[PDB]
């Protein structure tokens, strides 16, 4: 009498995978033949990626950047000449790294006012209290309030290629297009209304450490304040103490020449950012980019070590069943 | 002891006519439910956290622990509310039904509650008796009505009920005219048959004949009258005192072994929480010792925090680590374990194999909290007359005891009958096999007390251990067994008792004859105590089997011919004995596996969740920074990983339910609470510690790249915790999809639907969810994480590296 339906009687139509050696051992081979050909096409792609880094923090009495390692006259210029053995082929990406810089510290991550940087005309003149030690000064609200926007990387890197004669060729670097397209066009906007920017940022002061206010960060109206790409790239936090942030990008030439031909170069830094204190390093990183990103062998080596252990195990596991 | 006056002509102490079966009342539902919920560990522990979050300044917002807690307490109320609004509606119909009343020669129709003790009640054909009446007279000649007790004691015969012989003359005619009657009745007793009445109806001069009215005149409450035009009674019990309302006896047997292991894992997982928080605090202040490791000039403390007492910061830093790791205890376990028991105990009453064409009734669930105790039974305590023999054995009372011996249980037949009428029929009951050496302690061979102490000794020290399922069956009686328990405190060198417990553990067949109803609860209590906890079941049909049905770990009452006294005090009730096979073997085995794999998976999928957030503290400045977003710390337990394990625990047969009753041979023996011992516990803990280290240190080595895209753009800490969360949700989901051996159309809908919701949500939570937030911290974090071919390949790999030790078992469990 009870309702003799399929569901109530626990006899629903199901699948019940019956796992047999004729169906569970081939698994250890349909991956070992798939993970290894991927772990080899990645390991080969991450090898043909030409990159070079230069640590210019000083801290070595023989380094050219030791004169401004010390708290001295502030506009220091130290030049470090590196050399590329092999030319850089595609378009090249110049980074800058930092070590022992905890941009992921809790007291640091929360220290922005996202409604301010998103262009709230209300939150512009009263920033949050999360961004606290840098929320106000001299009874005035800081324009990009916070600790994230205060400590912004502010030393200038330039590259110079030394031609056949002794004179340096200035390599042209590009500022646009280094922030996510979304959080430059959407998530980071200027204050609402105004033809020139200095008027919008009216009742606010530059952050404590900056030397120029936000509305003086550039010249063209597409990079000026809260939109400036070097600013947007600094805000996006690190996820690790040792990180790097895109600085400039070098566009490939329409000719058949390399982007960065081999030779002796110059990296003449206008050293500003003091990391001598918290025992951090400062690096510049030139690199070429492939379909997988930058140079990282972990993906190739991990795909191989997993594709070559599943094929070994499938062999031991096929030794047992096929012989027994 | 009481006296009733019908006509208000004389020559309080008793209550009114209103039955309550509910637990809560609309006035006091919230304070009485919220108290009994926040009395459980993981409900009180999550309130201490929610209070700590709103006072102290902690890493995570209070929404991450007040939305999953309010949502879990609310669903566990709506359930227990409606599950109790029934008892209202179930009795609202019973005490709001119209009944006629003659107040003083005035025949009015009141409601069944408005009835007072000692008044005239008229019940025409086919109406349940509003109250426990005394049939002063019936209208027809000879005053006899035919009322069947279809609900009280399960019988279906038209029991005769005579009117008071002296006053059958009273035929509906104005019952106030000096109808003085002194009904000196006794206080209530639940015997349902035994009742001593005493009528002293005063005539013009005198009449006090002590007509001891009883089961022939006492018209019980809630028994429908049949084929009588109308009757005239008077109420002598009016509910909560009547015999029908004296048989509820609700008490707390419900404590399963899978519900007292849940508490053993919470006690463990709380020391993992006090260690994750004490380790990360000891390390936070060893690290903070270097003056440039606190306020390193980029994130500089504020004046308030830079002046707080260090002794107090060491405490608030500890609370902020308990709050950060507070998810390691599963919030939505209590609501899922008890939503599964409710909706799950329907397969035990919907089952067409628990249906008797004679009784025309099915199975019954009185408590839905021992479902998993049917698959853990170690002993069975039966009752000969009524369960094994009807009123010769029953349909299959001999082949079931085989299936109960093949499954490793030990059947004990506690009968209230003689020995030769029981044993010589037990030779047919087939618990005693033919080549079974029987060791008998019956009175007809033990007519000497000290010989028994030797008997105990000689059949043990020189017989039982100097030489066994098909081998030995003990046979006791009510008398010689009494001495082994009653007066066993004389000599402590080698007791009567401690030696009796050595053969009761190994003897698979035992038959205690001439057992008073108070020894059946002794033997269960003695067996429940030895060497751990042999989970005992007790199945009976009479009213003498209510002591052991209340005593044992689960009580299965048979809807027999004697009455519904054992069938209504029990936990589950089945209208046959042969239904013990399908109940233990097919329903108990499936009910236990479904909840013992939901308990393990609830603690597993939370350690995989928090271990990547405990590890991150070493790469944060031990500064308690949550790895995952806020919208992910809440939704994970209630939204992303909630239904796939619930649908599992309701529809999942890891052995096809037809090969489970066909094969008891080992299938029941495989799990003696096996799925939750220390063996399997630290296989899920050390698999969740491996999968947690892989999620983090595969995303840690992945982020040494300087870019994971082709346009060379870098990621933050929200595109770091999202890769760890994407791998974490897909692993714990595809870990269940590797454990289901029964894929219904629902296990496809909730598993592949929980993976597609996490992907739809993460693409939606990254759009227009701005106006009410102060974060925008995850704006395009999912939609950018997926625009990089190298991140799909990592996620696909780290999912497989993590699910390797589980695939490695499947193979090594198929093979050999
Ligand atoms: C010395 C130090 O810790 N940081 C200084 C800060 O005090 C100063 O206000 C800023 C001016 O641009 O330059 C940097
Ligand atoms: C650059 O910023 C650093 C840190 O905020 C500061 O110490 C330094 O003085 C700045 N130099 C400038 C603005 O030229
Ligand atoms: C580039 O470096 C060289 C080193 O002498 C020098 O020309 C100067 O420091 C830099 N370029 C400028 C600013 O002229
Ligand atoms: O480094 C100290 C220096 O920092 C900057 C300014 O705040 C100055 O007023 C102050 O003297
Ligand atoms: F068979 Al009995 F009490 F011994 F119901
Ligand atoms: Mg019986």
Task: Give residue ranges with CB within 6 A of ligand 2.
Answer: A 151, 154, 209-211, 272-274
Whether the Cβ atoms of residue A239 and residue A131 lie closer than 8 Å to each other:
no
CA of A147 to the centre of ligand 2 (A): 13
Query: Distance between the two ends of chain B, CA-based, in angstroms?
Result: 75
Determine the Cα–Cα distance for residues B401 and B409; give it in Å rounded to an integer: 9
Q: Is B383 a catalytic residue?
A: yes
Check residue B94 and report its DSSP letter: T
User: A-chain residues within 8 Å CB-CB of B804?
Assistant: 306
| Contacts with A2 from chain B: Cβ below 8 Å | 349-352, 355, 362
Q: Given an 8 Å threshold on Cβ–Cβ distance, is A287 in contact with B742?
A: no
How buried is residue B144: exposed, middle or buried, by Cβ count under 10 Å (0-12/13-18/19+)? middle
- Give the bridge partners for A79, in sequence order: A268
C-alpha pair distances (Å), B261 with each of B265, B266, B596 = 6, 9, 10
Burial A65-78 (b: 16+ CB within 10 A, else e): beebbeeeeeebeb
Q: Residue B532, SS3?
A: coil
Q: At what angle do helices B718-736 and B789-802 cross, to 10 degrees?
A: 40
- Kindly determine whether residue B814 and residue A19, on different chains, have CB atoms separated by under 8 Å: yes
Domain with residue B472: its CATH number is 3.40.50.1000
DSSP B205-252: S---------TTTEE-TT-BEES-SEEEEEEEE-SSSSSGGG------
Number of residues that make up chain A: 324
Question: Does any ligand 3 atom lie closer than 6 A to the CB of residue A79?
Answer: yes
Judging contacts by C-beta atoms under 8 Å, the chain B residues touching residue A50 are none
| Chain B residues within an 8 Å CB radius of A187 | 776, 779-780
Q: Rounded distance, CA B186 to CA A134, Å?
A: 86
| Residues contacting ligand 5 via CB (< 6 Å) | B 383-386, 415-417, 540-542, 544-545
**Cα(A73) to centroid(ligand 4), Å:** 14
**Token pair of B317, please?**
């830093």
Q: Is A95 helix (H, G, I), strand (E, B) or coil?
A: strand
Q: Compute the distance between CA of residue A94 and CA of residue A175 in angstroms, rounded to an integer.
A: 10
In b/e form, how buried is each residue of A145-159, taking b as 16+ CB within 10 angstroms? bbbbbbbbbebebbb
Please tell me what resolution, in angstroms, this structure has: 3.3
Specify whether the CB–CB gap between B475 and B513 falls below 8 A. Answer: yes
Q: Which protein residue has the closest C-alpha to ligand 3 atom 11? A: A268
Closest Cβ opposite residue B717 in set A17, A27, A237: A237
**Other beta carbons less than 10 A from residue B665's beta carbon:** 11
Distance between first and last Cα of chain A? 52
**Tokens at B569, concatenated:** 């005090």
Tokens of B67: 């939305």
Distance of CA B206 to the CA centre of its chain: 59
Helix (H) or strand (E) holding A22, with range, is: helix A21-24
**Looking at CA atoms only, how far is residue B774 from chain A in angstroms?**
6
* CA-wise closest residue to A241 among A131, A43, A104, A138: A104
Spatial separation of the C-alpha atoms in residues B442 and B447, rounded to whole Å = 9
Backbone angles phi, psi at A38, to 5 degrees: -85, -40
Closest-CA distance, A180 to chain B, in angstroms, reads 7
Q: What DSSP element (H or E) covers B705?
A: none
* DSSP H or E segment with residue B752: helix B751-764
Q: What ranges in A145-223 are assigned the alpha helix state H?
A: 147-150, 182-185, 197-200
Ligand 3 pocket, A111 CB below 6 A? no
Q: What six digits make up the tokens of B815? A: 């093979």
- Residue B79 CA to residue B185 CA, distance in Å, equals 43
Test site for ligand 5: of B383, B388, B425, B563, most ligand atoms within 8 A of the Cβ: B383
Residues of A in contact with B797 (CB under 8 A): 35, 299, 302-303, 306
State how far the alpha carbon of B466 is from the alpha carbons of B56, B462, B497, in Å.
70, 5, 20
* Among A96, A102, A108, A239, the residue to mutate for chain B (most B Cβ within 10 A): A239
Per the CB < 8 A criterion, the answer to whether B513 and B477 are in contact is yes
Instruction: State the Cα–Cα distance between residues B54 and B739, nearest whole angstrom.
Output: 40
Give the ranges where B531-588 is alpha helix by DSSP (H). Answer: 547-551, 566-569, 579-581
The one catalytic residue among B383, B541, B545, B571: B383
Contacts (Cβ under 8 Å, ≥6 apart) of B176: B7, B8, B102, B104, B105
Q: How many CB atoms lie within 10 A of CB B221?
A: 25
> Which has the closest alpha carbon to B392: B433, B430, B417, B429?
B429
Cα–ligand 6 centroid distance for B385 (angstroms): 4
| Cβ pair A278:B292 closer than 8 A | yes
> By what technique were these coordinates determined?
cryo-EM
- A 10 A CB-CB count for A35 gives 23
Instruction: Tell me the residue range of the domain where B402 lies.
Output: 364-387+392-584
SS3 of B133-149: the string is EEEEEECCCCCEEEECC
> Closest Cα to atom 1, ligand 5: which residue?
B385
Q: Ligand nearest B413 Cα, by number?
A: 5
Question: Buried b vs exposed e over B587-611: b needs ≥16 C-beta within 10 Å?
Answer: bbbbbbbbbbbbbbbbbbbbbbbbb
Cα B545 to middle of ligand 5, angstroms: 7
Measured between alpha carbons, how far is residue B146 from residues B133, B143, B219, B809 in Å?
15, 10, 11, 68
Rounded CA separation B224/B94 (Å): 12
- For residue B52, the tally of other CB atoms under 10 A from its CB is 18
Q: Within a 10 A sphere around the Cβ of B705, how many other Cβ atoms?
A: 22
Q: Please give the order of strands across the beta sheet that includes A51-55.
A: A51-55, A282-288, A92-98, A243-250
Separation of alpha carbons A11 and B474, rounded Å: 41
- Bridge partners of B230, per DSSP, are B124
B811–A28 CB contact, under 8 Å: yes
Cα–Cα distance, A87 to A257 (Å, whole number): 10
Interface A–B counts its CB contacts (< 8 A) at: 231
* Residue whose CA lies nearest to ligand 1 atom number 14: A209
DSSP assignment, residue A287? E
């Amino acid at each position: 009498r009870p309702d003799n339906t399929a569901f109530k009687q626990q006899r629903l139509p199901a699948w019940q995978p019956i796992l047999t050696a004729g169906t569970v051992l081939p698994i250890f081979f349909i991956i070992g033949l798939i993970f290894i050909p991927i772990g080899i096409g990645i390991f080969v792609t991450s090898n043909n990626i030409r990159e070079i880094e230069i640590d210019y923090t000083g801290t070595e009495p023989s380094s050219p950047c030791n004169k401004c390692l010390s708290p001295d006259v502030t506009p220091c210029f130290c030049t470090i000449n590196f050399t590329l053995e092999k030319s850089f082929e595609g378009n090249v990406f110049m980074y800058y790294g930092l070590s022992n810089f905890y941009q992921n510290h809790r007291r640091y991550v929360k220290s922005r006012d996202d409604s301010q940087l998103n262009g709230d005309s209300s939150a512009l003149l009263n920033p949050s209290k999360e961004c606290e030690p840098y929320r106000r000064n001299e009874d005035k609200p800081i324009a990009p309030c916070g600790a994230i926007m205060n400590s912004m990387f502010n030393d200038t890197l330039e590259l110079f290629l030394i031609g056949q004669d002794s004179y340096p060729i200035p390599i042209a670097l590009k500022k646009k297009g280094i922030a996510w397209w979304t959080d430059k066009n959407v998530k980071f906007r200027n204050p609402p209304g105004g033809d020139n920017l200095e008027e919008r940022f009216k009742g606010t002061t530059k952050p404590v450490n900056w030397l120029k206010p936000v509305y003086m960060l550039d010249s063209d109206p597409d990079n000026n304040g809260f939109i400036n790409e070097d600013f947007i790239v600094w805000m996006r936090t690190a996820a690790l103490p040792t990180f790097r942030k895109l600085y400039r990008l070098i566009e490939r030439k329409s000719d058949l020449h390399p982007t960065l031909p081999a030779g002796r170069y110059w990296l003449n830094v206008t050293y500003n950012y003091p990391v001598h204190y918290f025992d951090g390093r400062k690096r510049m990183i030139l690199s070429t980019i492939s379909w997988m990103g930058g140079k990282n062998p972990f993906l190739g080596i991990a795909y191989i070590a997993v594709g070559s252990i599943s094929f070994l195990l499938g062999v031991v596991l096929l030794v047992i069943n096929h012989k027994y | 002891t009481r006296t009733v006056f019908v006509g208000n002509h004389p020559v309080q102490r008793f209550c009114d006519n209103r039955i309550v079966s509910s637990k809560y009342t609309l006035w006091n539902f919230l304070p009485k439910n919220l108290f009994e919920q926040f009395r459980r560990i993981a409900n009180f522990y999550f309130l201490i956290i929610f209070l700590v979050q709103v006072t102290v300044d902690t890493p995570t917002s209070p929404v991450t622990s007040g939305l999953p807690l309010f949502f879990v307490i609310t669903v566990t109320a709506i359930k227990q509310g409606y599950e109790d609004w029934l008892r209202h509606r179930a009795d609202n119909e019973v005490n709001k039904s119209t009944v006629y009343i003659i107040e003083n020669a005035k025949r009015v129709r009141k409601e069944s509650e408005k009835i007072k003790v000692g008044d005239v009640v008229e019940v025409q054909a086919d109406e349940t008796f509003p109250c426990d009446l005394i049939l002063l007279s019936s209208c027809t000649t000879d005053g006899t009505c035919y009322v069947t007790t279809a609900s009280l004691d399960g019988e279906s015969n038209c029991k005769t009920h005579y009117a008071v012989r002296d006053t059958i003359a009273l035929c509906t005619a104005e019952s106030i005219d000096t109808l003085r009657a002194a009904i000196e009745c006794e206080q209530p007793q639940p015997d349902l048959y035994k009742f001593v009445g005493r009528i002293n109806i005063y005539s013009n001069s005198l009449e006090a004949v002590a007509r001891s009215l009883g089961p022939e005149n006492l018209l019980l409450k809630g028994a429908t009258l049949k084929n009588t035009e109308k009757i005239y009674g008077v109420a002598v019990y009016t509910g909560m005192e009547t015999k029908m309302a004296l048989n509820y006896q609700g008490k707390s047997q419900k404590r399963s072994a899978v519900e007292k292991s849940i508490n053993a894992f919470l006690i463990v997982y709380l020391f993992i929480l006090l260690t994750k928080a004490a380790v990360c605090t000891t390390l936070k202040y060893v690290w903070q010792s270097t003056p440039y490791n606190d306020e390193p000039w980029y994130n500089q403390k504020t004046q308030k925090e830079r002046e707080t007492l260090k002794v107090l910061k060491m405490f608030t830093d500890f609370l902020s680590f308990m709050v950060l790791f507070n998810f390691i205890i599963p919030v939505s376990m209590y609501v899922t374990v008890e939503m599964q028991k409710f909706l799950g105990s329907f397969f035990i009453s919907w089952d067409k194999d628990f249906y008797d064409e004679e009784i025309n009734e099915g199975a019954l669930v009185n408590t839905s909290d021992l479902n998993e105790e049917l698959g853990q039974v170690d002993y069975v305590f039966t009752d000969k007359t009524g369960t094994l023999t009807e009123n010769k054995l029953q349909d299959q009372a001999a082949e079931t005891i085989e299936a109960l011996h093949a499954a490793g249980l030990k059947v004990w037949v506690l009968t209230g009958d003689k020995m030769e009428t029981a044993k010589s029929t037990c030779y047919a009951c087939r618990l005693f096999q033919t080549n079974t050496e029987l060791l008998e302690l019956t009175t007809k061979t033990i007519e000497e007390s000290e010989r028994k102490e030797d008997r105990l000794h000689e059949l043990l020290i020189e017989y039982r251990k100097k030489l066994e399922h098909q081998e030995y069956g003990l046979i006791i009686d009510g008398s010689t067994l009494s001495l082994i328990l009653n007066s066993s405190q004389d000599s402590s060198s080698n007791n009567y008792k401690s030696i009796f417990l050595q053969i009761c553990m190994k003897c698979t067949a035992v038959l205690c004859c001439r057992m008073a109803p108070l020894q059946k609860a002794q033997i269960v209590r003695m067996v429940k105590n030895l060497k751990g906890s042999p989970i005992t079941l007790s199945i009976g049909d009479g009213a003498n089997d209510v002591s052991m049905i209340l005593e044992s770990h689960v009580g299965i009452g048979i809807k027999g011919k004697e009455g519904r006294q054992a069938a209504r005090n029990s936990d589950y009730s089945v209208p046959k004995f042969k239904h013990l096979k399908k109940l233990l073997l097919a329903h108990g085995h499936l009910y236990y596996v479904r909840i013992a794999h939901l308990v393990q998976y609830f603690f597993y999928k939370n350690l995989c969740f928090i271990l990547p957030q405990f590890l991150y503290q070493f790469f944060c400045g031990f500064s308690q920074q949550p790895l995952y977003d806020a919208a992910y710390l809440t939704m994970y337990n209630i939204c992303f990983t909630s239904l796939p394990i619930l649908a599992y625990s309701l529809l999942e047969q890891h052995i096809n339910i037809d090969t489970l009753t066909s094969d008891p041979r080992l299938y029941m023996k495989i799990s003696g609470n096996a799925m939750l011992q220390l063996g399997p516990f630290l296989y899920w803990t050390f698999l969740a510690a491996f999968e947690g280290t892989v999620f983090f240190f595969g995303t840690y080595f992945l982020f040494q790249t300087a870019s994971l895209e082709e346009n060379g753009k870098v990621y933050g800490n929200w595109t770091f915790g999202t890769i760890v969360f994407t791998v974490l949700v897909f692993t714990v989901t595809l870990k269940l999809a590797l454990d289901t051996r029964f894929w219904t159309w629902i296990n496809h809908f909730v598993i592949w639907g929980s993976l597609a919701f996490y992907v739809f949500f993460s693409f939606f939570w990254g759009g227009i969810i701005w106006p009410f937030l102060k974060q925008q911290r995850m704006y395009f974090v999912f939609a950018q994480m997926l625009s990089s071919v190298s991140t799909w390949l990592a996620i696909i790999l780290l999912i497989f590296i993590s699910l390797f030790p589980e695939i490695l078992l499947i193979v090594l469990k198929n093979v050999r």
